[PDB]
């Protein structure tokens, strides 16, 4: 009966928690206590990218570490040449309420979506001189919160309804649907080998998915409120999540447990965007208090502060070569830091 | 300095900037509004009337054009979104106003409507965003009050001790009891409004029927008022 299934679920959860406690012998703080702190980190604003009419919700760096796509609520994607602050393209959108954007690894496509419930994919390199909508993907019943490219023909989208989906771009249809969340899915991060990906939802749980099979390998529940951002460690064996409980948490897939928490007594606003550095020694996390902090991912010590925005930081992206960190906010300015 | 191709790249960027300037005028001369309500509230009738008078299966947002005195207006409402609202409501903190249509002739879901209005009003991101509530379906309210079969006293105990405010202006001439009831509903919403406003945003009551043709004018007057007040705070007059 339903009571029997409920009791079975409770027993399974208890068994899982007992196993997780069994695998816990020394906290990462103890094993890291004997390394040199990174010391104070000062980063300066190198470029300010002006031109966006309204607040910016998303950004994505290019794999060439020079091009940059930015999305704003006024209904535009602007592709910036970060070195010279030139504008390469200005793509007008049908729906102005765009709140995700991605830049294809090959550099041929850019995707965007939002409250329109459609993941629109744009072709940058056409025989004509303009950028055209290659194809619009429909099928999500909620807002599209994040989308990421696996190759030029596959895209992974997270949506307002409790569902992620893997799309074929040539044939609009969904190849696989990922279900299991009990709340809105807000973020998404692909593994470096592009075989696994994690999604953070509004149920205070993060799940690691299997792209090929389509089943949830593990579920991570340590947070106290909804998760706003998520990103893989460059190893492929960890990820960090920022939630509305004003804390960032680092999980491990192999231990399947929460390692370390980055919290401060002063900080009460929630994290809105989380990104690692190349080595993973730094964990840059945006906040609602207009400032982005830098945490030592191994020691939970606040190393630096990136304070240059007159409104909340909505997006945050570290480039592939590690030379720069880009930050977008609701004041319609992007900033390249170094 | 910089080579010929870089000259041409900068010139293309300048062309893009000029196009962006043209967009800005239209973008800043057009006022955006968010339409909210329940399933029973006649907001579909309001949007149909506004679309007719002036100016794709799982789509999540619908957009409406209308123009009053050579001033443009956008009116969005959410179509496919789920019942949970705390995440996508943040995208609408720069709108001129929020239009909250509520069905005043239900008496049963009206407490849920009050709770929804309370959540909208006290939202951390929807501060400095005023609300234009349309206490819709007034003719059904009149019919149901004059019928007498269903009473408001049992849903809201405080109605027995309530009395009509002196500022009420029943224009056409109707039974005073329906006027008392409708002003009681308005005062409940206004109580939730004035509990914790702090003067950053206001609430504009209006009694409307879905057939009424003054809704566009009424939104225009309210939006004019909001912009004026905002301008006062912006030009350092208060």
């Amino acid at each position, epitope marked *: 009966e339903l009571d029997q299934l409920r009791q079975e679920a409770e027993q399974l959860k208890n068994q899982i928690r007992d196993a997780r406690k069994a695998c816990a012998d020394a906290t990462l703080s103890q094993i890291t206590n004997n390394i040199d702190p990174v010391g104070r980190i000062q980063m300066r604003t190198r470029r300010t990218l002006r031109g966006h009419l309204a607040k910016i919700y998303a950004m994505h760096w290019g794999t060439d570490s020079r091009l940059l796509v930015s999305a704003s609520q006024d209904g535009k994607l602007i592709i910036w040449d970060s070195y010279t602050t*030139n504008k390469v393209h200005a793509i007008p959108l049908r729906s102005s309420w765009v709140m995700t954007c991605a830049y294809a690894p090959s550099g041929n496509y850019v995707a965007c979506g939002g409250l329109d419930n459609i993941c629109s994919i744009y072709n940058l390199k056409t*025989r004509e*001189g303009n950028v055209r909508v290659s194809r619009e993907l429909a099928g999500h019943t909620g807002y599209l919160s994040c989308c990421r490219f696996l190759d030029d023909n596959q895209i992974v989208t997270s949506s307002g309804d409790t569902t992620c989906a893997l799309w074929d771009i040539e044939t609009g249809q969904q190849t696989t649907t990922f279900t299991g969340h009990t709340g809105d899915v807000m973020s998404l991060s692909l593994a470096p080998d592009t075989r696994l990906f994690v999604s953070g939802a509004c149920d205070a749980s993060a799940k690691l998915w299997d792209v090929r099979e389509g089943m949830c390998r593990q579920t991570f529940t340590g947070h106290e409120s909804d998760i706003n951002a998520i990103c893989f460690f460059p190893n492929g064996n960890a990820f960090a999540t920022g939630s509305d409980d004003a804390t960032c948490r680092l999980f491990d897939l192999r231990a399947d447990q929460e390692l370390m928490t980055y919290s401060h007594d002063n900080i009460i606003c929630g994290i809105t965007s989380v990104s690692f550095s190349k080595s993973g020694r730094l964990l840059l996390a945006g906040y609602d208090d207009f400032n982005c902090n830098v945490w030592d991912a191994l020691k939970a010590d606040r190393a630096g502060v990136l304070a240059g925005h007159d409104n909340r930081v909505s997006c945050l992206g570290v480039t592939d070569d590690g030379m720069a960190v880009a930050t977008g906010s609701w004041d319609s300015f992007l900033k390249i830091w170094n | 300095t910089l*080579s010929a*191709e870089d000259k041409a790249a900068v010139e293309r960027s300048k062309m893009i900037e000029k196009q962006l300037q043209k967009d800005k005028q239209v973008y800043r001369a057009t006022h955006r509004l968010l339409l909210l309500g329940a399933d029973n509230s006649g907001k579909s009738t309001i949007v149909k009337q506004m679309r007719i008078y002036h100016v794709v299966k799982t789509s999540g947002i619908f957009e409406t054009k209308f123009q009053v005195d050579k001033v443009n207006f956008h009116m969005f409402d959410v179509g496919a979104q789920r019942d949970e609202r705390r995440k996508w409501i943040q995208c609408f903190n720069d709108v001129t106003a929020i239009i909250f249509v509520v069905d005043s002739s239900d008496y049963n879901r009206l407490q849920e409507a009050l709770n929804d209005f309370k959540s909208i009003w006290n939202n951390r991101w929807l501060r400095t965003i005023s609300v234009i509530l349309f206490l819709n379906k007034q003719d059904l309210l009149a019919e149901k009050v004059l019928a007498g079969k269903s009473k408001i006293e049992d849903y809201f105990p405080e109605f027995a001790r309530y009395t009509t405010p002196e500022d009420a202006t029943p224009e056409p001439g109707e039974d005073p009891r329906v006027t008392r009831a409708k002003y009681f509903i308005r005062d409940e919403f206004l109580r939730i409004s004035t509990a914790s406003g702090d003067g950053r945003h206001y609430c504009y009551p209006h009694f409307t029927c879905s057939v009424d043709t003054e809704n566009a004018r009424r939104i225009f007057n309210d939006c004019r008022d909001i912009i004026q007040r905002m301008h006062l705070r912006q030009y350092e007059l208060l």
Partner: single-chain antibody
Amino acid sequence: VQLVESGGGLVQPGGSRKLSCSASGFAFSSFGMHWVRQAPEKGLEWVAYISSGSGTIYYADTVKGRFTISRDDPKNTLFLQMTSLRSEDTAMYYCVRSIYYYGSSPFDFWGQGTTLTVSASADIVMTQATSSVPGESVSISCRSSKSLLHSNGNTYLYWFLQRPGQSPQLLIYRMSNLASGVPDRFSGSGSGTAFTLTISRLEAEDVGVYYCMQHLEYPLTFGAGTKLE
């Protein structure tokens, strides 16, 4: 995309003629455009360039005052008004399409050309090797008077192939990037002054004249070009 231009014929010396280039199939207003000509038996030579939005107009030294260039975006045509035609203007005028942003491919498309006949300093000199050279591998070479490497990191060298009937089509841009549609056989290399173009497996359609280009500074000189047979 296509660029059809017309307006050529016999003209008495000292006369005037207007050449128009009708464009269709691409976003015309966003493409800067050039005019390139070649004498009945000589190499190509740059004439004029009009930018996107008509804000930057350059002319070659030999036509500095005689010609004027203009475009009509709504009508989607490109003009070249010529006045006082000398006898050294007999050529086939080509209509060239070029765009400029980071990563772009200038000079990607060329027009068919018009036949025009007239009755009886510190610029980069591009010098080609002897103008005569299946399954084999050829290594057409080139040289420049001034280093084509810039502080940006891009060396502006362009390779063009002209087959016997058609107008030239781009093969390599910025000496390393294969143009869209060119087979993987072609590849380019160089060091700043000397450059080479290599065809790994020559085929029947690879015969023609190979012209090079510099795009570091105006005017854009070409070079005589090498003939494969």
